[PDB]
């Protein structure tokens, strides 16, 4: 890399429309700016383009969780976990952006933002009555921006809706009446590598639009299409996302013992 094209706002809008983003809808965005860059206006230019594509009637949504099990969450100050990217960390600090008030936070901006983020602490994080399920309920679109289905949180929601038989102990920390309270729960967590199987599943039914957004390979799928397709596979095999024991994956092995 050396003298690469720095996409302007109008071009990014065109790439988003050409990919299938429709005005006035709900759009959940997972992004890796390292794949998107360089843009003319940096990470902020990507957010501005996403919102200009959705128009004033649409709602931009992004993950916003802190990734910290032992610290309480503050929607006004808690940084997002570094694994979510700089765009998610910057998005929630912008004006009029709403954020959920629990460590498994999402952020949203638009006429439907508070229908998406105004739920209390969900257990498990991606259960119903959580932001990722509200996006599914609101029939929104999911856009992966330089990341694969290993970052498609909607697939973890599909795992729960299938009542998948694995669940490992996890915990977070909240502030109740001024004292730090830890909250233990069971999460359907593994290595997430085999989430990539959704590529072939969704493409075989022609449910995944692909194209460039900036410099990144972008995948655009409906939330209902992600859940329905994943449920169809989990209905054939609930352990489809876990590595076989021969693979030696520690985390998937831990999920297998939890059954
Ligand atoms: C906030 N609680 C979290 C807990 O929810 C969990 O979150 C997992 C995360 O650890 C996994 O991370 C796993 O996969 C990563 C790459 N995708 C690499 C690291 C691996 N442990 C994610 N794949 C799925 C999350 N829901 O990670 C442990 C934790 C920090 O206690
Ligand atoms: Zn694994």
Numbering used by the authors: -1 to 257
List passages from the publication reporting this PDB structure:
To understand the structural basis of the highly promiscuous nature of group 1 Antibiotic_NAT enzymes, we pursued structural characterization of the AAC(3)-IVa representative of this clade in complex with AG substrates. To increase the chances of capturing substrate-bound enzyme complex we used the catalytically impaired His154Ala mutant of AAC(3)-IVa. Using this strategy, we were able to determine the crystal structures of AAC(3)-IVa enzyme in complex with gentamicin or apramycin to 2.6 and 2.8 Å, respectively. In both complex structures, the electron density corresponding to the AG molecule localized to the cleft between the major and minor subdomains of the enzyme. In the complex structures, the gentamicin molecule spans across the enzyme’s minor subdomain while the apramycin molecule is twisted nearly 90° relative to gentamicin. Additionally, Glu185 appears to be a critical residue for interactions with gentamicin and apramycin as it positions the 2-deoxystreptamine ring for modification through interactions with the 1-N of gentamicin or the 5-hydroxyl of apramycin. Interestingly, Cys190, which is just N-terminal to the Zn2+ binding site, interacts with the 3-N of gentamicin. The analysis of the AAC(3)-IVa•gentamicin complex allowed us to propose a mechanism for this enzyme’s ability to recognize 4,5-disubstituted AGs. In the complex structure, gentamicin’s 5-OH pointed out of the enzyme’s active site. If similarly oriented, 4,5-disubstituted AGs would not cause a steric clash with this enzyme’s active site.
Here, we conduct a comprehensive functional analysis of the Antibiotic_NAT family of aminoglycoside acetyltransferases. AG resistance is primarily conferred by three classes of aminoglycoside-modifying enzymes (AMEs): phosphotransferases (APHs), nucleotidylyltransferases (ANTs), and acetyltransferases (AACs). AMEs permanently alter the AG substrate, preventing them from binding to their target, the A-site of the 16S rRNA in the bacterial ribosome. The fold typical of the Antibiotic_NAT family is evident in all structures, composed of 13 α-helices and 8 β-strands, and determined structures superpose with pairwise RMSD’s 0.8–1.0 Å between 197 to 266 matching Cα atoms.
